[PDB]
Design a protein around this nucleic acid. Sequence first.
DNA 1: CCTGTGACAAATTGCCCTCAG
DNA 2: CTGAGGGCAATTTGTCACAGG
Length: 225
Amino acid sequence: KRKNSPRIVQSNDLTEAAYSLSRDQKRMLYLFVDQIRKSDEHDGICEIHVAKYAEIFGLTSAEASKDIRQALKSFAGKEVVFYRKGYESFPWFIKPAHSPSRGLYSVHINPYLIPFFIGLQNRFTQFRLSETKEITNPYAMRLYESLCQYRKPDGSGIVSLKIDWIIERYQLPQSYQRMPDFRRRFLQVCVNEINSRTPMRLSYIEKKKGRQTTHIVFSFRDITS
DNA sequence: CCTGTGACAAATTGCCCTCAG
DNA sequence: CTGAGGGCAATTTGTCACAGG
Ligand SMILES: [Mg+2]
Ligand SMILES: [Mg+2]
């Protein structure tokens, strides 16, 4: 099969939020949201084990330590903003991470994010973790999550996304407001990298209005077709 | 206006090595 | 032996000048 990798289940509000995290931060953010789904009333305290992280992401003990230490530092000052319109901004962490023993980090998610993570019925995105552990460009990650929000059961879909919305929720660098660059350094990159490192296969077409290009119409099928 | 491309810069990659318990 | 450190060269991301439809 391919069903042994953990099932990531995030609310569509998180899928659509505007924030900025590295690949490495997003890698961890998948793990945290997994822990949180164990509540009979959860508090926002998560733990991270170097040794297991290495096995999941195919990295050496030493380099897995570099990756974790450096991102935990980079969280501070980083906000996530939720919409639906609507406008709300929260901090990811409320305390610095730390290590009570070798190999172990304790992080403290803002408890208020707990409902935005768990979400509402028939209103959520889902994907296996194995589906996304070989992506490098975090932007390629954000797009894949989005596509997954519209995946039918047979692993196929069609969705049109407006470009001014991608620049906003995915918080793209300034210069990609000039379409030639948006084309070259974001769209063609994140599409090839999905085609290569995920079980999804993707094509696209550009919706133009006047001289301006305004929407990307993404459609895809699953490799097991 | 729109487009693509060449050049330059600043950032991320996997990889190497030392050293402490 | 693991993992907390320091470091590096090659490749990928981000910016912007110039040329043409
Ligand atoms: Mg990054
Ligand atoms: Mg790394």
